[PDB]
Amino acid sequence: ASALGKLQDVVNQNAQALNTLVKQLSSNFGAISSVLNDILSRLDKVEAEVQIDRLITGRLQSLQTYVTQQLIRAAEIRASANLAATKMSECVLGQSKRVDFCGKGYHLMSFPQSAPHGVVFLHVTYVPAQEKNFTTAPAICHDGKAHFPREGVFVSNGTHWFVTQRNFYEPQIITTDNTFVSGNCDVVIGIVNNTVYDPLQPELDS
């Protein structure tokens, strides 16, 4: 039952101050009694005027306390509401590129769900799992040209340098359609030897 505390806290604090605001009716505030009529019943008005001031001044102040709290507290909700309206627009209606705005992990989609005086999102996120230690290289010399991965990176399980996408392991034989050439070898730090297979070359020989 503690997952909803955020909502539960809002509802309580509202009902909280109301209780407090009510209980302020029963306080003397320096006046002879907290029942507005008793001051009128016991005392002649001339004097009862000054008494009722201490009630009014007390109570009238006690509202401004309550009102100011609500204003401040609403300004928090007003901020939280925009956070929702931001998520609802970006997360639910679109797909968010903002890391950990929609909740931990790469975000796929979100499902809004209503809750009393609140909203609850179900964020369907993509969390990778199982790792392998790979030896990697930023580039591969072929003929002395350098080949860099068009998307993703080079890795090598053993001798065969595999280009693959970053966030999931799908090894692929390295061909020029996976790599764009740039510069040449002597510059790139840590470039390694390999042979980048040609799609076209085999198609030829016939």
Partner 1 sequence: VDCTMYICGDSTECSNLLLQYGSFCTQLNRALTGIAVEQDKNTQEVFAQVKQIYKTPPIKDFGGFNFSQILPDPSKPSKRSFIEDLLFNKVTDLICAQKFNGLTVLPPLLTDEMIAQYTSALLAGTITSGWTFGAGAALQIPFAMQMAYRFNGIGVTQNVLYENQKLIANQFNSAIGKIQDSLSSTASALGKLQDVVNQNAQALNTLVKQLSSNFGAISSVLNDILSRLDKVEAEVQIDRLITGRLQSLQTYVTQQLIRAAEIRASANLAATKMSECVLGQSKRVDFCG
Partner 2 sequence: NVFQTRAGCLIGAEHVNNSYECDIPIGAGICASYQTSQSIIAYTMSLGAENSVAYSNNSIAIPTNFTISVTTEILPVSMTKTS
Which chain residues interact with partner 2 by CB under 8 A? 3-4, 6-7, 10-11, 14-15, 18, 70, 73-74, 77, 80-81, 83-84, 87, 102-105, 108, 115, 117-137, 153, 155, 164, 166-169, 190
Q: C-beta of 166: minimal distance to ligand NAG in Å?
A: 15
- Pair of tokens at residue 63: 């509202």
Residue 187 binds which one of partner 2, partner 1, ligand NAG, none, with CB within 5 to 8 A depending on kind? Answer: partner 1
Q: C-beta of 133: minimal distance to ligand NAG in Å?
A: 4
Query: Strand 146-149 and strand 140-141: pairing?
Result: antiparallel
Element spanning 69, H or E: helix 45-87
Burial (CB count <10 Å: 0-12, 13-18, 19+), residue 88: middle
Tell me how far apart the alpha carbons of residues 49 and 46 are, in angstroms, rounded to a whole number. 6
Query: Strand 140-141 and strand 192-193: pairing?
Result: parallel
- Secondary structure in 3-state letters for 95-113: CCCCCCCCCCCEEEEEEEE
Site membership for partner 1, residue 45 (CB under 8 A): no
Tell me how far apart the alpha carbons of residues 161 and 194 are, in angstroms, rounded to a whole number. 7
Q: C-beta of 203: minimal distance to ligand NAG in Å?
A: 33
Site membership for ligand NAG, residue 206 (CB under 6 A): no
User: Which of 55, 139, 163, 196 lies at the binding interface for partner 1 (CB under 8 A)?
Assistant: 139
Question: Cβ closer to partner 2: 137 or 146?
Answer: 137
Site membership for ligand NAG, residue 131 (CB under 6 A): yes
What crossing angle do the helices spanning 45-87 and 5-23 adopt, rounded to 10°? 170
Q: Which residues bind partner 1 (CB under 8 A)?
A: 16, 20, 23-24, 26-30, 58, 61, 65, 68-69, 72, 75-76, 79, 97-101, 104-106, 127-129, 131, 136, 138-139, 146, 148, 153, 166-167, 180, 182-183, 187-191
